[PDB]
């Protein structure tokens, strides 16, 4: 009775619908209305819930977009809990830069990636991206984190023609949860 406001995926259904509603928003080129915040605030939501998952479209701005979620990131710097979060193709650039905060303390990239020990997976992800090469290579490592408090926040730069193929897309990345493990055995298939 107590605690059903929230469910496990009830909250994200609703707030995913309303931003694709601006996804395809009916705006004219002769007068294109901006409006990047309308799911900076529907997603910011979201993650103040607790599932972190749900998907989000830019109409204009790329370089202000890709430092804007990593504004969410500071919402876990307070939580004492880091996250792991790439943009898109623009994201290698970023490594050289981005030095504010993600200089290299996301959360199990220690000895995971160089030197096969696990690290106890209790990280946020979100992975903004126009290239769905980036959303497929991040899934698969975050599938072991997402086994324990781990979740996938991504927006994209790709999908104002085709929205719902970019889901089917990252589901492709080898994620897939049957019952007593996840896809955390395939690394490549």
Do not use: A, C, N, Y
């Given at each position: 009775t107590s605690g059903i406001h929230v469910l496990d995926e009830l909250s994200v259904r609703a707030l995913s619908r309303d931003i694709m509603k601006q996804n395809?928003?009916?705006?004219?080129?002769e007068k294109s209305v901006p409006r990047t915040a309308g799911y900076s605030d529907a997603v910011s939501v979201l993650a103040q819930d607790r599932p972190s998952l749900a998907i989000v479209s830019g109409q204009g701005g790329a370089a202000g977009q890709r430092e804007r979620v990593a504004e969410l990131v500071m919402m876990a710097r307070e939580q004492g809990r880091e996250v792991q979060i790439i943009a898109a193709d623009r994201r290698s650039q970023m490594n050289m830069?981005?030095?504010?905060?993600?200089?290299?303390?996301?959360?199990?990239?220690?000895?995971?990636?160089?030197?096969g020990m696990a690290f106890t997976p209790g990280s946020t992800v979100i992975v903004d991206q126009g290239e769905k090469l980036s959303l497929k290579e991040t899934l698969t490592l975050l599938d072991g984190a997402a086994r324990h408090n781990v979740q996938v926040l991504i927006t994209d730069?790709?999908?104002?023609?085709?929205?719902?193929?970019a889901l089917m897309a990252m589901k492709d990345a080898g994620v897939n949860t049957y019952r007593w493990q996840g896809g955390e055995q395939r690394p490549a298939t």
């Open positions: 395809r928003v009916t705006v004219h080129p830069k981005q030095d504010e905060r993600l200089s290299g303390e996301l959360i199990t990239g220690r000895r995971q990636l160089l030197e730069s790709g999908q104002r023609t085709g929205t719902g193929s």
